PDB file of C-alpha atoms in Angstrom:
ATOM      1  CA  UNK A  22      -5.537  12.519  21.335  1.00 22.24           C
ATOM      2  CA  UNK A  23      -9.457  11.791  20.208  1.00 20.00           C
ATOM      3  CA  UNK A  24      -9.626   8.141  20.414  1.00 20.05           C
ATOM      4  CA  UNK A  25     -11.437   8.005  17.136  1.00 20.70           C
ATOM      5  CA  UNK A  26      -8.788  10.603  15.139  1.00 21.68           C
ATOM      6  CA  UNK A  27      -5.772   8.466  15.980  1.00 23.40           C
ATOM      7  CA  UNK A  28      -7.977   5.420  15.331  1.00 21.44           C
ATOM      8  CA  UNK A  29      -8.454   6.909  12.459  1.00 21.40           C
ATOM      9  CA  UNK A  30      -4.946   7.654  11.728  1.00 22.62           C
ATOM     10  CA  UNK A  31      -4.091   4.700  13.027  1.00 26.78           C
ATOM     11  CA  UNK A  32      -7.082   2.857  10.551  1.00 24.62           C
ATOM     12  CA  UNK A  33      -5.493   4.764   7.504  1.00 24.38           C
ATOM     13  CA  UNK A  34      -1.558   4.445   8.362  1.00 22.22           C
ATOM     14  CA  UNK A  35      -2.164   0.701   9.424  1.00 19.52           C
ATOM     15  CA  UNK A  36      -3.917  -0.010   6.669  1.00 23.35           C
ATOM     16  CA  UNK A  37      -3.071   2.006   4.180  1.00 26.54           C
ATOM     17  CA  UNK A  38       0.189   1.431   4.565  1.00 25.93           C
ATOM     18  CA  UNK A  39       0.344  -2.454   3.898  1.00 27.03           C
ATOM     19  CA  UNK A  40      -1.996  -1.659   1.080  1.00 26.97           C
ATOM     20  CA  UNK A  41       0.994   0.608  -0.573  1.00 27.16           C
ATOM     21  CA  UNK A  42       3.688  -1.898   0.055  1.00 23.70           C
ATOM     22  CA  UNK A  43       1.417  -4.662  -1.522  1.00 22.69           C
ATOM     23  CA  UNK A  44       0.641  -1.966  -4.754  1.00 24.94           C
ATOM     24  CA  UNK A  45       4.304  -1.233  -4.265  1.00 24.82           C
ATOM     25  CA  UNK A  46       4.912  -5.246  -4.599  1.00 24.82           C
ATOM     26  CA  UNK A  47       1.862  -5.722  -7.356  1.00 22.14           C
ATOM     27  CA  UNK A  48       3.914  -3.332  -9.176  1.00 22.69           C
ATOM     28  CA  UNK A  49       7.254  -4.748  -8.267  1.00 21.12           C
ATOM     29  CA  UNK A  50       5.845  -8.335  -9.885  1.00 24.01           C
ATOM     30  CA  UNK A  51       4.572  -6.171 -12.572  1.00 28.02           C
ATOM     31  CA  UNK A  52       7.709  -4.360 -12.886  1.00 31.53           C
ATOM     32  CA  UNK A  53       9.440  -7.853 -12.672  1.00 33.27           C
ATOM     33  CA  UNK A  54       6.748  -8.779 -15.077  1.00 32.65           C
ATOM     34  CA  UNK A  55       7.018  -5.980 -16.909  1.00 30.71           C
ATOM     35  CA  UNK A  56      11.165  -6.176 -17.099  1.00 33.14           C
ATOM     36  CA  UNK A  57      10.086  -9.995 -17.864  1.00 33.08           C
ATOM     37  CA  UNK A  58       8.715  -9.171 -20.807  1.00 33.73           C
ATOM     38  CA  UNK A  59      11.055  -6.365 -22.562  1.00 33.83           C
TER      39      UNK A  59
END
């Protein structure tokens, strides 16, 4: 494949996903925070 598309894939899936878990876990806190709270 184009060394710069999967790079690209690879630079949005790598990332990206990380970034999701960690607004899936800011949310989880939140949703901790937010069950916290009531």
């Amino acid at each position: 494949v184009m060394p710069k598309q999967i790079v690209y894939w690879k630079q949005w899936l790598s990332l990206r996903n990380p970034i999701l878990v960690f607004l899936k876990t800011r949310v989880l806190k939140r949703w901790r925070l937010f069950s916290k709270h009531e």
